[model samples]
Target chain A: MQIFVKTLTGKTITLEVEPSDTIENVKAKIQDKEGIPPDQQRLIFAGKQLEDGRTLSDYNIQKESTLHLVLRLRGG
Target chain B: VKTIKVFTTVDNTNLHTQLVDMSMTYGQQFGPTYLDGADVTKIKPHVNHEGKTFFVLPSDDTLRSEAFEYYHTLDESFLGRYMSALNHTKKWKFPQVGGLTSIKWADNNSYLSSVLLALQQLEVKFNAPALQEAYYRARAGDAANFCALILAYSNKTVGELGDVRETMTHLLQHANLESAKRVLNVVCKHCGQKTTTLTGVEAVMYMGTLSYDNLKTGVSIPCVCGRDATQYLVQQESSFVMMSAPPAEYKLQQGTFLCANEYTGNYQCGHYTHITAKETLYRIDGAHLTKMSEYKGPVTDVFYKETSYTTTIKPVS
Candidate 1:
């Protein structure tokens, strides 16, 4: 399945993903496409923060729904 | 015929009684005619949204093997005979109870009570506070509150018993001070101006002052020949003392040069110019020259220590 990822700059990049793919996997895929480090990106879907180690389907994501992306600051 | 779902491991533990009671309760509520050996066959439970207890059965053979370790028997007392008759094998056996074990039993009311009992069992298992208030609320048939209480208690109990993840962090700063303490006697090969330089914090303090960065940047002692004629002959061992005091006005600039006389006058200090020539020193945060007692320079062999790099961790789902 594929979903639209909306970036902080309002650019939306469509990504192909599996239902069983973990959030970390999605973060890495975003990193591969956009040069943003995985650790510095936060993905939000269904008005909830997407957590690591959980699969895409656990959030009941459907095709073409926009997932919001927020850049995180370094060194908390 | 109405039926109920029973989830349990098929082992000889008290699991059989629960299955039997579940079947007889269904039989009593629906009717005494609910049981029939030939009528029974494997069937999945109809899990409704309102069902207090529920589980998902494995679809594949691989998972089925594991699932049976705590299998869901979805029917009545006829289960054993049904399986036996269906498979033409006599291995199937139900519990030896003569009749349904009598208990506070009814239709959906009994089920509601059973749900409450299940909650109590969970509380005891987790050593959590009993939720009798939840039971009464559920008994009132307030489906909204009942359902809410079900999840509420389960989630709360899970908080008390489930996996705990805490990211414990220790904030510590360790400075490995490589104090360059020694005396190097150098002979000016060009002017024969033999100069001795004390190479530690003491030597650095004598030259002027020291910052963590300045200590590491090291210093070059000019032989007054205006050339690189200083040659090291031999070095005398010296002692290093790292002490702390009040903060001073001395400040390091661009990690290379130090302020002259706590920024008192023109920066024409020869000590600053000499040390700034060639550079490298470990710099630390919140460190001041006045807080330290160490040699500043003519340190032929200078080493440094600093508090660098930070790490952190957080807890989340």
Candidate 2:
């Protein structure tokens, strides 16, 4: 299904993902497409982190789900 | 150099007549040019002679040479006298040249001598080695914002420096702890179902209540159900809704709710509602209602509904 992903620079990207994918797998896929590191990547659904090992099904997610990916910078 | 002809006229009536006549006479007697070598002594100036005009003969070469030498010597003597006068006046405070002296004297005293002396003393006392060491220490401590590390470090004693270093260490430790706490708070807010779930309930309830109110008022209410529940509540509809209750029933093992609602009707009506997640109540009036309608939503739902109370009376049967 189509997923809306936002980058640190306020840019948006649309991607397709499977329903059974975990947050970690989605993160890796995002890293592959956007070159964002795992440590720096912050996957926010609505406004909170997606739980570890939790699949999209756990949150009742469906096709065309939009997720925000904020980059964690070093300094405050 | 080749000789070139220059035109001139004799002015017998003017005082310059004597000089011109002398030059012409000297040139004619010797060579074509009179300024280079001329017999000035032979062409005598007589006040009684009217329009005195004479030409030196070519045979008078020795007289022409001597006259040229005399003219050069006189010119040099006059220039030397004027130069000496200028030099003396420039050094002394003469009435006419006093302004020039004042400027030069102040510059010499204030800038060249006094200020230079003070700066030299300061340079000698501080020295290059001390400044270099101060700069190095400041860089190591991340204290390079000051204008000069020498001045900043110089203000403290060795013991004071040690104390400052210890204070900085403590400060860094505190900062790290504070940062860790912030991260934990975010994690707790994210993973804690008590907080997250309550927030989610608050989200749906807020929209539901607003939908109820809009129906009552015969007005339109727009709803934004975001990608996540909290975003819909906190970000999109936070101004219209308030968290009046805390996350109830916090359980570390099973992850229960962190707080519960007291069911107090004290909160303002219409857009205002109690948020169960943050335990904060927010008030919403006419202004917030306007804002809620204007908000954009990819997952936005907008509709208008009306509510009317109905009553029935009948005789006892």
Candidate 3:
């Protein structure tokens, strides 16, 4: 499956993913691509925060689904 | 290091020109005017108005310089859509901040200096070490903003630092919360007979402009009633943006957004209003505004929660 992600600053990027990919795996890829850490990421799918261990297919996350990415605070 | 994002609403030309002279004369040697040896760069000014020509200078960190914001918001159209834009990003008060480590962060936000500055004044009275020196340094920068803090902190007009000594002494003997905030409710010197004392300028140069943490937060009081309606508490200056019922909410949290319509209650959060009323984003400090207007564009379709009134906010993809 393919997907698109957008930053709060409105920077958007498209990515290719597989339905079997774990939500955390997608987040890890986003982290590498966006430089925002995977842990700091709050990936919301269908008005909910996607758990790391859950499968993207479990959320029924579809092809070309747009994931809104917001950066969380980094603790000192 | 003076950040231009910190000086968007100061409509004082005298201060601007003074800064120009200050930068020209002492910026290189004194390290006070434009610390880090800055050469002023001219940005356009508001003809026949206080939005005088602006100057951009280097920050204390030579690698990163500062420049006043001149582009965007060149007209009143930004103001017209301000309320709606605010409503759109209202949920962002929580949605945008990134990361969550095992610790707390400082409210050391420059834009939050409104309340922070007043608190600083209260601190001077009691000799309190509120925050970091860098925090203090950034709070009162070189331009008009510096003197503006002086003016309000002392309740004395321009060019009167000695008064602050006596003023601080007196305040030390007697200072209260109300008195602290009262001190910051200063008039805009940038405007003379034409300046509107009771007016509220749309907060621009807000957080996340050039850096993160520029949200211009203010204390907007909800209606006195507990709940028949919330006021949404917009602003009350001569120039006010009265929002509709569902559009008003708190930018309280960060990292993610939740629809204002879905949020009916949060004790920590202010209430909503039923009637269309005028509100004031109350004074937080003297010339103590940090820059950056929230997101300049429309959030008509931005992602937000369905309104569970919970703390967890994430952008709905």
Runs in model 1 deviating more than 4 A are B1-317
The true-versus-predicted C-alpha distance at residue B63 of model 3, in Å, is 56
Whole-model alpha-carbon lDDT for candidate 3: 0.29
Docking class of 1: incorrect
Instruction: Score chain A of each prediction against the true chain A by TM-score and list the results.
Output: 0.90, 0.82, 0.85
Q: Weakest 10 consecutive residues, lDDT, candidate 1 chain B?
A: B164-173
Best by DockQ: 2
What lDDT is reached at residue B82 by model 2?
A: 23
Each model's iRMS? 32.4, 24.1, 19.8
Which of the predicted structures, 2 or 3, would earn the higher DockQ when compared with the native? 2
DockQ of each: 0.01, 0.02, 0.01
| Model 2, span B44-150: residue lDDT tens | 33343344343222234443344233222222122223222222223322111111111112111111111111111111122233233322332243212111221
Candidate achieving the largest lDDT: 1
Model 2 regions more than 4 Å off: B1-196, B199-317
Q: A1-59 in candidate 2: lDDT tens per residue?
A: 87777664678777778889887888888888888777556565543445448887776
Superposed by TM-score, candidate 3 places the C-alpha of residue B67 at a distance from the truth, in angstroms, of: 55
